[PDB]
Amino acid sequence: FFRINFSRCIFCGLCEEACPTTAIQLTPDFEMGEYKRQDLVYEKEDLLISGPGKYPEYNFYRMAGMAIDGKDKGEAENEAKPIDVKSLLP
Amino acid sequence: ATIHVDGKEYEVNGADNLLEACLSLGLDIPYFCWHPALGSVGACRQCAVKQYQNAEDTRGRLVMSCMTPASDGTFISIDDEEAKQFRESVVEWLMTNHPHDCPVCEEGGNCHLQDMTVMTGHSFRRYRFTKRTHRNQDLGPFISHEMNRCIACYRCVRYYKDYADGTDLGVYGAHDNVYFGRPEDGTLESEFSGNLVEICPTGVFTDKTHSERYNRKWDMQFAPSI
Amino acid sequence: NIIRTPETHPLTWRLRDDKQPVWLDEYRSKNGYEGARKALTGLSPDEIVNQVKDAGLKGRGGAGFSTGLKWSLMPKDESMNIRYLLCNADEMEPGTYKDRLLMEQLPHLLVEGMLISAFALKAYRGYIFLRGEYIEAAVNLRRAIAEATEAGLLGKNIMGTGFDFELFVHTGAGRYICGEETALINSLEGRRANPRSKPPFPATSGAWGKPTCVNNVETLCNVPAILANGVEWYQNISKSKDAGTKLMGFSGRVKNPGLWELPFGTTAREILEDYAGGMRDGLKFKAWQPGGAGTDFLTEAHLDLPMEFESIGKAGSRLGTALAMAVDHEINMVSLVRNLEEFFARESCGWCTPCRDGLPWSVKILRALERGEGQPGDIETLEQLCRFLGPGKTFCAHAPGAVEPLQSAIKYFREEFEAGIKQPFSNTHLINGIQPNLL
Amino acid sequence: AFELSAAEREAIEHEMHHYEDPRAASIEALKIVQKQRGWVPDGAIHAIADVLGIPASDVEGVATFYSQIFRQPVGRHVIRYCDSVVCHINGYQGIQAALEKKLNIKPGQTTFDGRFTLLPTCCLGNCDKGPNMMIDEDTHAHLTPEAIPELLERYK
Numbered sequence: 047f048f049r050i051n052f053s054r055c056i057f058c059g060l061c062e063e064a065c066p067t068t069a070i071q072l073t074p075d076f077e078m079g080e081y082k083r084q085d086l087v088y089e090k091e092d093l094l095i096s097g098p099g100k101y102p103e104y105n106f107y108r109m110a111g112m113a114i115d116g117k118d119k120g121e122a123e124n125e126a127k128p129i130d131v132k133s134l135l136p
Numbered sequence: 137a138t139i140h141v142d143g144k145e146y147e148v149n150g151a152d153n154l155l156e157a158c159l160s161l162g163l164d165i166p167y168f169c170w171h172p173a174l175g176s177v178g179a180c181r182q183c184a185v186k187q188y189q190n191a192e193d194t195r196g197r198l199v200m201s202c203m204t205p206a207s208d209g210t211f212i213s214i215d216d217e218e219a220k221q222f223r224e225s226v227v228e229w230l231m232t233n234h235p236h237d238c239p240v241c242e243e244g245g246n247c248h249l250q251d252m253t254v255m256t257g258h259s260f261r262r263y264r265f266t267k268r269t270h271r272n273q274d275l276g277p278f279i280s281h282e283m284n285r286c287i288a289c290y291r292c293v294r295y296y297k298d299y300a301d302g303t304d305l306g307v308y309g310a311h312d313n314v315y316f317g318r319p320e321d322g323t324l325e326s327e328f329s330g331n332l333v334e335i336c337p338t339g340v341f342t343d344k345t346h347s348e349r350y351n352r353k354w355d356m357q358f359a360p361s362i
Numbered sequence: 363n364i365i366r367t368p369e370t371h372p373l374t375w376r377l378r379d380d381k382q383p384v385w386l387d388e389y390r391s392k393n394g395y396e397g398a399r400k401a402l403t404g405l406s407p408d409e410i411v412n413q414v415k416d417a418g419l420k421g422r423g424g425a426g427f428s429t430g431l432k433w434s435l436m437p438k439d440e441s442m443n444i445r446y447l448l449c450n451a452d453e454m455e456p457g458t459y460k461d462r463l464l465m466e467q468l469p470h471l472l473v474e475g476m477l478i479s480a481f482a483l484k485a486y487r488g489y490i491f492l493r494g495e496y497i498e499a500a501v502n503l504r505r506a507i508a509e510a511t512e513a514g515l516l517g518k519n520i521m522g523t524g525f526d527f528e529l530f531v532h533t534g535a536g537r538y539i540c541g542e543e544t545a546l547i548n549s550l551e552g553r554r555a556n557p558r559s560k561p562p563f564p565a566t567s568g569a570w571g572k573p574t575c576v577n578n579v580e581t582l583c584n585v586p587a588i589l590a591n592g593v594e595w596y597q598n599i600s601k602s603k604d605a606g607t608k609l610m611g612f613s614g615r616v617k618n619p620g621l622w623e624l625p626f627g628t629t630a631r632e633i634l635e636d637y638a639g640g641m642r643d644g645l646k647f648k649a650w651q652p653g654g655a656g657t658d659f660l661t662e663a664h665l666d667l668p669m670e671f672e673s674i675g676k677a678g679s680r681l682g683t684a685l686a687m688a689v690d691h692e693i694n695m696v697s698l699v700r701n702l703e704e705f706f707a708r709e710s711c712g713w714c715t716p717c718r719d720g721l722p723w724s725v726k727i728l729r730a731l732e733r734g735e736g737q738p739g740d741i742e743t744l745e746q747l748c749r750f751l752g753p754g755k756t757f758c759a760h761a762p763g764a765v766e767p768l769q770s771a772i773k774y775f776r777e778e779f780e781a782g783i784k785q786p787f788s789n790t791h792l793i794n795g796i797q798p799n800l801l
Numbered sequence: 802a803f804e805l806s807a808a809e810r811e812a813i814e815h816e817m818h819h820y821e822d823p824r825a826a827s828i829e830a831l832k833i834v835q836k837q838r839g840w841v842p843d844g845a846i847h848a849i850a851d852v853l854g855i856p857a858s859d860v861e862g863v864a865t866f867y868s869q870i871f872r873q874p875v876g877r878h879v880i881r882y883c884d885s886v887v888c889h890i891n892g893y894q895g896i897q898a899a900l901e902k903k904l905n906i907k908p909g910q911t912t913f914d915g916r917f918t919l920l921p922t923c924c925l926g927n928c929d930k931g932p933n934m935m936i937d938e939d940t941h942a943h944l945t946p947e948a949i950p951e952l953l954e955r956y957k
């Protein structure tokens with residue numbers, strides 16, 4: 047779950063600056079002024095946009111070293127195929 | 137029992153190494169392979185401090201703090217430019233092969249390698265070539281295994297085998313392809329294997345029980361319990 | 363050809379002409395085991411050690427340390443009655459082939475030298491830590507041990523005096539790091555061949571926690587002649603400050619490669635052109651390494667200095683196994699140094715970071731430089747590796763010597779290294795929405 | 802499944818009393834087991850560890866440290882050429898090209914049918930004599946790219 051209290055957010059942009067995966071960004075559009083203040087707490091469903099935002103081609107998991115469904119151990123960016131210790135080569 | 141660190145003169149136990157004494161005095165020397173319970177081995181080479189003599193030797197020699205006896209007539213300098221540069225280059229060599237995954241590492245804000253990388257003042261990558269990668273093992277239902285993040289400091293093996301007498305964990309391979317894990321996938325037999333999650337300075341061995349419901353160290357709320 | 367005589371050629375003198383080994387009968391015939399008999403029935407320990415210290419024998423393995431001091435280091439107390447003497451027959455150095463000759467064609471020489479040295483040291487067992495790729499050498503050594511055992515030269519009561527000295531052979535798997543003095547001990551213990559920190563020296567605590575003196579093959583072959591002919595004779599072979607004879611040779615594309623026994627004061631040019639013949643038919647001299655791979659390159663100007671420890675040590679290089687290699691003009695220096703650094707990097711162990719993690723970086727930089735994909739800051743990164751891998755920064759001496767040919771080739775031939783830098787340094791990949799930090 | 806033969810177990814037990822510690826016979830036990838089968842199977846690790854008295858982790862560390870204790874299936878006649886400085890100078894590259902052109906493989910692979918593995922070796926300690934190579938236990942020096950076929954035809 048992702049949850050951001052928009053009754054406290056001052057829109058500083060420090061969050062977007064800290065995100066190492068470019069997931070969270072500040073886009074030019076304002077929140078509707080809610081009626082109850084409870085409805086100003088967004089819970090991922092609201093926040094998750096359909097698109098890549100400002101940075102179009104960056105893929106963190108293409109950089110990471112751990113394996114996911116897409117990439118195996120030696121398929122990251124600037125990485126070598128894993129040499130097994132039981133190899134024959136010296 | 138009276139060493140000179142960067143001009144200052146301290147009083148230390150002359151029966152322990154210079155890393156132990158300098159850390160007891162409050163000074164800051166980086167070190168990966170020393171542990172105050174597993175003795176000192178000079179493997180990582182990361183606790184280098186310049187050592188002079190005669191109190192007027194202007195050209196000392198780099199030597200590892202954890203391996204020098206810290207005797208009486210000892211003159212060292214943690215902040216020497218050559219010592220600083222060597223300590224920095226030593227972490228740079230470790231960073232040559234590291235995996236770009238701090239965000240997904242089980243231990244961010246809790247990793248000793250991050251501490252020492254920010255401590256040696258290294259924040260620029262000159263390496264350009266590929267990194268070595270490794271396949272993981274299934275070590276049990278307790279601790280995970282990510283050998284991509286290993287810096288080969290030998291703490292796991294030293295603890296697990298020479299300290300806790302484990303008999304089912306060791307080191308394999310050689311020449312920058314070294315490997316630390318079980319001879320085959322399977323659960324770790326030692327009763328005291330959990331301590332590998334904090335003995336290992338990197339995020340190679342991290343417990344699964346916390347990895348399932350994870351939260352960074354800062355977010356945690358502790359209290360002294362038994 | 364060379365006229366060998368027991369006076370000037372103590373080692374290579376008995377070697378029969380047809381290259382076949384010299385077995386026990388022919389060896390004893392040519393004054394074999396006379397030195398061992400003299401030492402066992404006319405001397406005592408603490409006297410053979412002093413005879414070896416006064417003769418001035420020095421380590422022939424490459425270190426150059428005095429053998430008499432090495433043996434004196436042993437503790438003097440009869441509470442330690444279990445001591446070991448390990449011969450370092452593991453001869454892995456890209457350029458040394460001198461122990462092959464000795465323990466292939468003269469196994470009894472090494473057997474007798476080891477017997478004398480283990481009597482001097484009060485050691486009850488001796489392990490010939492063999493290479494593994496030496497098949498004929500192992501066969502001959504075991505045959506010589508069996509002959510000397512059957513003939514009384516080995517076993518419980520060796521020729522009257524009470525001295526057992528059982529002698530074994532250990533043909534190991536192929537790793538160059540097991541040649542190290544205190545990694546050989548680990549490998550003999552049956553563990554991973556990782557060096558050990560000194561102090562304690564192997565002399566006080568060595569093989570299995572017992573005392574131990576590790577000696578090369580030629581050093582131990584030197585001893586039988588010292589004892590048999592006298593200490594003064596060995597002292598006076600030639601007027602150099604490194605007493606005795608040495609196996610020197612020139613490798614490479616010379617007209618007659620090999621190794622010979624020389625008076626340890628011979629100029630490197632006297633080996634290249636008088637003995638080895640010189641460069642062959644159209645090749646021109648460019649550089650040379652004195653000793654095995656792991657010693658500094660030297661140009662043609664350094665070809666006239668005498669082959670001894672102090673001279674070549676002051677010339678920048680170091681005399682190792684004294685088996686030179688001649689590199690002719692047609693060899694690119696970057697390709698040669700890459701071929702050396704990839705061996706020194708793949709042949710290492712994993713214990714210390716500077717070696718394990720910095721030698722591969724130099725290998726990759728050299729591959730990029732020889733492919734033509736070098737970048738600014740490469741040679742300045744290689745030079746930083748020659749200072750931070752030097753002696754004291756690494757756990758053992760493998761990297762300090764591994765990075766000697768690199769710096770020594772940079773010094774003399776920087777042009778061939780610069781000629782590879784043909785790229786603009788770039789390391790990032792230009793993420794789209796981020797503006798790069800300029801310079 | 803793996804179980805130690807009688808000859809190799811007897812040889813290991815005879816080697817175990819050449820030393821003060823049984824562990825010291827680990828490299829020789831691995832070399833015996835490899836001599837019999839050409840490589841060290843995954844069960845041989847635990848078998849040797851049970852014979853000696855040391856754990857399988859130590860035996861597996863010893864076996865994967867040293868380069869001549871094969872832990873992967875290797876053909877017969879494991880060709881090992883030398884590619885070090887003295888040979889690099891004498892032209893071991895032509896020798897490697899003519900070898901991997903005739904075997905139709907790359908360094909580190911078996912051919913097709915389980916003969917003629919191809920490996921590089923550190924140095925064969927026979928430098929003054931041309932580019933060298935070992936086939937199984939025979940050292941072949943003064944190698945020429947012309948004589949690689951006839952020299953390989955001797956091993957069947």
Ligand SMILES: Cc1cc2nc3c(=O)[nH]c(=O)nc-3n(C[C@H](O)[C@H](O)[C@H](O)COP(=O)(O)O)c2cc1C
Pocket residue numbers: 420421422423424425426427428429432450451452453454455538539540541542543544576577578579581758759760
């Ligand atoms: C990396 C390394 C490899 C070595 N390899 C050998 C070797 O292959 N053969 C050898 O005799 N000495 C070798 N040595 C030197 C030994 O450590 C030791 O000094 C020598 O074998 C015996 O000492 P001595 O020269 O006084 O006889 C090597 C040293 C190092 C650091």
Ligand code: SF4
Pocket residue numbers: 050054055056057058059060061062
């Ligand atoms: S911009 Fe982000 S970091 Fe700043 S107050 Fe708003 S949500 Fe919090």
Ligand code: SF4
Pocket residue numbers: 234235236237238241242243244245247248249250285337338339340
């Ligand atoms: S081990 Fe430490 S430095 Fe390495 S990726 Fe994980 S958090 Fe980052």
Ligand code: SF4
Pocket residue numbers: 285286287288289290291292293316335336337338340341
């Ligand atoms: S696994 Fe962890 S403790 Fe073991 S060598 Fe690697 S970094 Fe050190």
Ligand code: SF4
Pocket residue numbers: 539557710711712713714715717718756757758759760761762
């Ligand atoms: S320098 Fe360090 S890593 Fe290299 S062989 Fe010596 S101990 Fe091993």
Ligand code: FES
Pocket residue numbers: 155166167168169170177178179180181182183200201202203
């Ligand atoms: S902590 Fe001293 S060498 Fe690693």
Ligand code: FES
Pocket residue numbers: 456457883884885886887888889923924925926927928929932933
């Ligand atoms: S370099 Fe090949 S035989 Fe020595």
Ligand SMILES: [Mg+2]
Pocket residue numbers: 151152
């Ligand atoms: Mg203490």
Ligand SMILES: [Mg+2]
Pocket residue numbers: 113119271272
């Ligand atoms: Mg995996």
Ligand SMILES: [Mg+2]
Pocket residue numbers: 272273274
């Ligand atoms: Mg897995």
Ligand SMILES: [Mg+2]
Pocket residue numbers: 131132308315318319320
């Ligand atoms: Mg493994």
Ligand SMILES: [Mg+2]
Pocket residue numbers: 243332333334335336337338339340341342
């Ligand atoms: Mg950990």
Ligand SMILES: [Mg+2]
Pocket residue numbers: 432433435563564565566574575576
């Ligand atoms: Mg000694």
